[PDB]
Amino acid sequence: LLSLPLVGSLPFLPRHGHMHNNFFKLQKKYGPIYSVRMGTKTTVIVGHHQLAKEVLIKKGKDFSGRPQMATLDILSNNRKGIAFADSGAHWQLHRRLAMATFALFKDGDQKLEKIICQEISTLCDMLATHNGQSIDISFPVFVAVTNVISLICFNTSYKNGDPELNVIQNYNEGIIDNLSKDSLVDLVPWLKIFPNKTLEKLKSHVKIRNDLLNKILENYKEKFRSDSITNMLDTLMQAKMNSDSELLSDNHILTTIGDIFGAGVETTTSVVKWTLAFLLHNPQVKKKLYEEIDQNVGFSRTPTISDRNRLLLLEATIREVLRLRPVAPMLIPHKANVDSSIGEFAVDKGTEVIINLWALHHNEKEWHQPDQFMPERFLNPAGTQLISPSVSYLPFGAGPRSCIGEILARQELFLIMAWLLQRFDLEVPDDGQLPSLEGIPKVVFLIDSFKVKIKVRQAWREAQ
Ligand code: HEM
Numbered sequence: 001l002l003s004l005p006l007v008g009s010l011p012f013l014p015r016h017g018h019m020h021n022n023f024f025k026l027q028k029k030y031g032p033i034y035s036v037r038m039g040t041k042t043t044v045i046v047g048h049h050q051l052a053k054e055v056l057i058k059k060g061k062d063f064s065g066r067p068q069m070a071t072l073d074i075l076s077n078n079r080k081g082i083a084f085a086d087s088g089a090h091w092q093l094h095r096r097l098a099m100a101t102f103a104l105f106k107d108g109d110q111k112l113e114k115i116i117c118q119e120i121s122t123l124c125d126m127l128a129t130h131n132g133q134s135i136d137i138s139f140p141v142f143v144a145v146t147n148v149i150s151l152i153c154f155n156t157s158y159k160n161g162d163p164e165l166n167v168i169q170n171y172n173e174g175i176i177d178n179l180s181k182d183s184l185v186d187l188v189p190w191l192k193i194f195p196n197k198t199l200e201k202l203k204s205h206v207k208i209r210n211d212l213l214n215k216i217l218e219n220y221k222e223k224f225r226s227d228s229i230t231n232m233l234d235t236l237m238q239a240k241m242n243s244d245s246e247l248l249s250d251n252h253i254l255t256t257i258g259d260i261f262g263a264g265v266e267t268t269t270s271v272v273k274w275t276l277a278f279l280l281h282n283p284q285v286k287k288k289l290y291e292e293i294d295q296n297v298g299f300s301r302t303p304t305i306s307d308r309n310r311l312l313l314l315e316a317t318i319r320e321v322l323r324l325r326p327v328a329p330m331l332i333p334h335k336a337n338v339d340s341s342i343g344e345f346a347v348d349k350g351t352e353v354i355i356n357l358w359a360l361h362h363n364e365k366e367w368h369q370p371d372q373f374m375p376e377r378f379l380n381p382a383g384t385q386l387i388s389p390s391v392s393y394l395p396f397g398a399g400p401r402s403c404i405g406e407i408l409a410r411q412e413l414f415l416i417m418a419w420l421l422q423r424f425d426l427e428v429p430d431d432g433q434l435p436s437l438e439g440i441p442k443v444v445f446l447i448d449s450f451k452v453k454i455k456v457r458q459a460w461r462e463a464q
């Protein structure tokens, strides 16, 4: 009477719970760092901030690779661009170019605060027409951030009603949906197991997206001139002519613009939706934010970047949203470029390594009541300045593969929330339904579409 032969073993049920939460629960049994193997591939899950900072910072270069995935190969055209590119010359080149591009908006007649505030005023006007109604603000916000990125990349933007915006929204939604079912970290490779159309569907969306990028590129090749470097595509093209020109082919440049448009639009739109959601569940915090803005900016002017020194609760709220609901609760998978180690455990070349950011932001030894939305935790006991209550906090990642849009992201988020609170009461709809805060884990941690009643504030109207 013997034990059964065991051909496979998994520690939890696939497709049951959010994987990032499942991995975190396993830490109780197994500690902050453990592995799983799928056939020949081995993946390592890291869940403590110290070990995470070893992988991301102290040994960044050792762990800066990206694993190959069938779906990411499609979206990135066989590993071009920045985000899904393996570490290497192509990756390093476009990455630095993209970062240098942000210097052309440091100030001057192309100031980032002004570009953003231009789109936000259009967004505000649009939303004012819905005065007294309940709406889903996904699309207006998406259009506003799409313009901002479009100005950074091409110095161009869309007029309201350009149906191209609906086209983009449509393939974005389709890409995000098919890129993964679960998180980007899929436990079992079901895609390569059962008959399915996922790759063909993803191809189809990626086709439409690429053909649109091709179109914009051929138009820009004729508008481009060496004496005017004002946007990202200039930088890529200026760099191509000075040139190792195999790293700056057409596909490379498109894939790069693709990632920039991708991350620029989807992440920022998502965090605004989450922020509005959390405020609808917390009228009291929302009350104090109105009081804060009314008493620090008033209705004599619009909010500006420099008001982030004054509106501290607004900055704390944004930080607390990125804690509870990180856009990428498992970053993007890393990969060991060389043989190495984490916490003095050996990690081989080619081993996939996921940072469970969700664990870092809910670690009970590092955060007081992690389950709770408490913007206060980012304010000194008085409320006079911001502080870092924990080092176990990495919403934008760190080291070599860290976010390159973080400042753009922080500022866009700050200004949208600041303007919106200045002009609008944002209440629960007359149906009384609150948004679900459970979320949907894709490559981005989406929130369910919900509605808000939007009303021009009486205090703003009086300002005439
Ligand atoms: C609230 C908004 C955002 C958040 C929370 C965020 C967070 C992150 C995270 C976690 C990563 C991956 C770090 C890693 O893989 O270790 C990342 C990577 C990246 N992000 Fe952001 N991001 C945001 C907005 C943006 C924006 C606005 C842009 C572009 C302007 C952008 C461009 C990128 C790119 C290109 C990468 C890949 C970097 C590489 O592999 O070298 N992100 N971001």
Ligand SMILES: CC(=O)[C@H]1CC[C@H]2[C@@H]3CC=C4C[C@@H](O)CC[C@]4(C)[C@H]3CC[C@]12C
Pocket (backbone or CB within 6 Å): 075, 083, 171, 172, 175, 176, 179, 258, 259, 260, 261, 262, 263, 266, 267, 327, 328, 331, 332, 443, 444
């Ligand atoms: C937050 C983050 O890490 C960013 C880095 C690159 C970003 C991706 C880059 C490209 C795309 C394709 C686009 O159509 C939709 C979003 C999507 C899939 C982005 C989602 C979020 C990603 C993964």
